[PDB]
Every structure is written in structure tokens, then in C-alpha cells.
Amino acid sequence: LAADAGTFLSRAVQFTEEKLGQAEKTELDAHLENLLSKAECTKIWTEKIMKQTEVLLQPNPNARIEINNPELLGQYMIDAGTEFGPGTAYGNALIKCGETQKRIGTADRELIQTSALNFLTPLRNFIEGDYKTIAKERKLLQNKRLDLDAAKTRLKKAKAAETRNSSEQELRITQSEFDRQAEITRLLLEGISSTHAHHLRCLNDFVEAQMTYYAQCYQYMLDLQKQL
Amino acid sequence: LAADAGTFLSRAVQFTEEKLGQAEKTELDAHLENLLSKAECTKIWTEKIMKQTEVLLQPNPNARIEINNPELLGQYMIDAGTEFGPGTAYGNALIKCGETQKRIGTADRELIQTSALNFLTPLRNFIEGDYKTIAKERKLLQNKRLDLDAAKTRLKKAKAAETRNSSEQELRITQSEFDRQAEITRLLLEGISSTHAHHLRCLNDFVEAQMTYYAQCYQYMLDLQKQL
């Protein structure tokens, strides 16, 4: 209850003095330190790639917030050709081109849905399922470290019998707690390795989707050329 | 000088009477009417098609007013690969994919240059030339028609035989200018026939451009698949 509030205040004091430079800072084991850094970079890069991919798939920002451009152009062409006269060669071409443009529009929508269910979703799930969990452990680990240094300062300021005696007992518990949290954090950080391999498989899926999209559109264009 | 004001007054008054329905309106010959309508329709439809084509090629409105999305995504992927370790399989894939994404971006830029100069330019030229010239002559033709109807109104209101004879001469003068302007506009309207044939060749060029873009992109994607 109220005790919770007091503990928070003490933590800030230690943090400030460390930044002030009048206090030193305990360093985590290199292995754990390296693991923490690796996870951070993974989230940073994955976020950027996913966001830009969405912009590429749906160029219209308003549509991304939400008829695709290709089909709209096809609609105008068909209507114009009818007015210009279906028999007239110019009208004939406009009508056929409009139809082909609409077929291309269909292929685009298929690609967007396919990519989202095989690429955007898995990458997003990683941050939602793994990163968020790791974030919680990271915060708790830092909290324990702050308390350890705070007790250390008291032990350094040993000027009385009870001070020395209590400091030793207090530090013993603080050290053990920090060590316990370290083990749990290490385990989760170890899972990141599998995350990379999983993401690799999803990347292959995105590449395949684009190939199919371009192949379908190419054939559609070839047909229009023959008809025209 | 004062003549300018006088001419405006006569035209507006007669027009208002016709609008009110109290005054009758001299109609034009069917041939000229048909030609004028055809030209107007051509410009309206051509304007819409060209504008939508611009949106399709350059989805970004700001860029349309002026790096492409594909190349930017390529940059992110290559950078991430390095951090994740070029040797690492995940890093290798990210780097290769980014490179191909930039190549696709390059082909897009070529299409924009090729298409705009072979499709948008001609459509715009027609609207900037054939239509405008016709509109100017069409406006003067309406002014001449108003002068003719004003002369007819003066003629019917010319109770005095001598005044009516003067109105007959005035009517002949207005009729001659009116007929002359009709012929001038008619000649410009005949030009729209050639515009359609020219526009058809331009449409074929736009189709060819799109086919090349899709073909090149397909090959690029195929190569990336093999390397990965």
C-alpha cells in the first residue's frame, strides 16, 4: 500500500545521483546485456520494415486508413468509349483497355490480403507476444538493480554497528533477488533466436506473393495487346 | 469606347428576354450543333482520363505535384540485414530482397517518364489547343447569335417602315457576321475527328509502357527467388 510509494521515491534518488555522476552504477553480466540489446534492435528494424511495406501495398494514405485507382480509370475509359461510339475503333480500344485495367485491379487486392495474412500479421504478432513480455522483465530487472546500489551506498556509509549489521543482511536479500530476476530474463531473451528464423520464413512468403501479382498482371497486359 | 458598353447592353438584354421565354431564340443549323457537341464531349472525357492516369502512376499527391516507396523499403531492409549480421541467413535474405526492391523502384521511374511523354502530353495538348480555340469561336458565335436576335427584336419593334428597313440592313449585317463565325467554329470542330485518331495512337503507347514495366518487374522477382 503506502510502502509501495516510499520504495519508488528511494529508487529515483539513486538513479539521479548516478546521472549526477556523484554515484556509480552496477553493470549487468555481458551475456544478459548482449541479449537485451539484440532484442531491442530486432523490434526497431521489424517495426520500420512492416510500416513501409503497408505504404507500398496501399499507396493511398486515406485508403490505408480505410475502389482502387486502376479500376476507377478503367470505369472512365469504358464510359467514354461508349459515348465515343462502340463501333469507332477509338471507342473499341477505350472499352477493352478499361476491362483489362479492372482485371489488374483485382490482382492487386488479392496480393494485399495474401501478404497481410502471411507477412504483416506474423511480424506484428512478434512484438505483441514476445517483445511486450520481454519489456516487462527488462523494467523489473532495472528496478532490482537500482535497489541493490541504494543498499550498497548505505553499506559504504557504514558509521554504526547496526548500520553495518543491517546493511549486510539487507544486501544479502537484495543480491539474491537481483540474481533470481536475471535467470528469468535470460530465459526469455534466449527465445529471440527462434523469432529470427520464424521471420525469415514469413519473408519468403512476401516475395512469392509479389511474384504471383506481377505474373498475373503481365499475362493480362499481353491479352489486351492481342485484342487491341 | 462607349461602343464597347453599348454592344454588351444589347446582347445581355436580348439574352434575358429569351431566358424569360417572352422573346424567341434563333436556333443554329443541325450540322454545326452536332459538331459543337462532339468537340465538347471529347474534351470532357479526355480531361478525366488523363488526370486519373497521373494519380495511378504517382499515387502520392505531393509527389504528383512535384525517393519512391519501393527504393525506401529497400534501404531499410539492407540496413537491417547488416545489424542482424550479413552472414546470418535472415540478414542475407533482407539484404538481397532490399536490392531487388530498389531495382523495381528504378523501373517505375522509367515508366513515369515513358508514359507521361507518350500519353498525358498529347491529351493535355488537345485540351490546351483544339478545345480552347473552338470555345473562343463558339463564344463569339453566341455573341453574333445574340446580335442577330437583337436585330430581329429591333426589326419586329420597328413599326416605322424606314426604321424596319434600317433594322433589315442591321439584321443582314448581324446575319453575315453570325454565319461567318459559324463557319470558323465549324472548321475547328472538323479537327476533332483527327484528334481521336491521334489520341488512339497515344493510348497504344501507354499500353506498351505498362507491359514493359510488368515484364521487367517479373524478371527481377524471379532472380531474387533463385538467389534466396
Side-chain angles (χ1 to χ4, degrees), chain B residues 183-202:
Chain B
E183 175 68 3
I184 303 178
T185 323
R186 196 183 70 64
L187 302 184
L188 308 186
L189 299 164
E190 302 177 301
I192 303 300
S193 306
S194 177
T195 302
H196 293 181
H198 166 61
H199 280 2
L200 174 71
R201 297 177 287 120
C202 309

Side-chain angles (χ1 to χ4, degrees), chain A residues 89-156:
Chain A
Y90 184 58
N92 276 298
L94 285 183
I95 299 176
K96 271 311 175 183
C97 294
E99 307 174 1
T100 301
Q101 212 78 2
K102 289 186 174 181
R103 302 186 303 179
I104 296 184
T106 300
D108 165 61
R109 295 192 175 120
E110 170 187 0
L111 164 81
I112 303 180
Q113 177 182 0
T114 302
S115 301
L117 302 188
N118 304 301
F119 188 60
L120 296 192
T121 301
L123 299 192
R124 205 162 297 117
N125 297 358
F126 150 80
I127 308 182
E128 295 165 357
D130 313 301
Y131 193 62
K132 294 180 169 173
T133 310
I134 305 177
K136 312 159 187 175
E137 320 304 300
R138 214 166 189 178
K139 171 187 176 182
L140 188 53
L141 181 74
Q142 169 69 3
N143 301 357
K144 306 295 183 177
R145 190 199 65 64
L146 276 180
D147 305 0
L148 180 69
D149 304 3
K152 288 178 174 181
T153 63
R154 169 182 297 116
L155 175 74
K156 169 188 177 181

Side-chain angles (χ1 to χ4, degrees), chain B residues 136-148:
Chain B
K136 305 156 190 172
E137 299 311 299
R138 194 171 189 177
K139 171 187 178 180
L140 186 54
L141 171 67
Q142 158 71 1
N143 302 358
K144 293 305 175 177
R145 186 193 65 65
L146 283 190
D147 299 357
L148 178 74

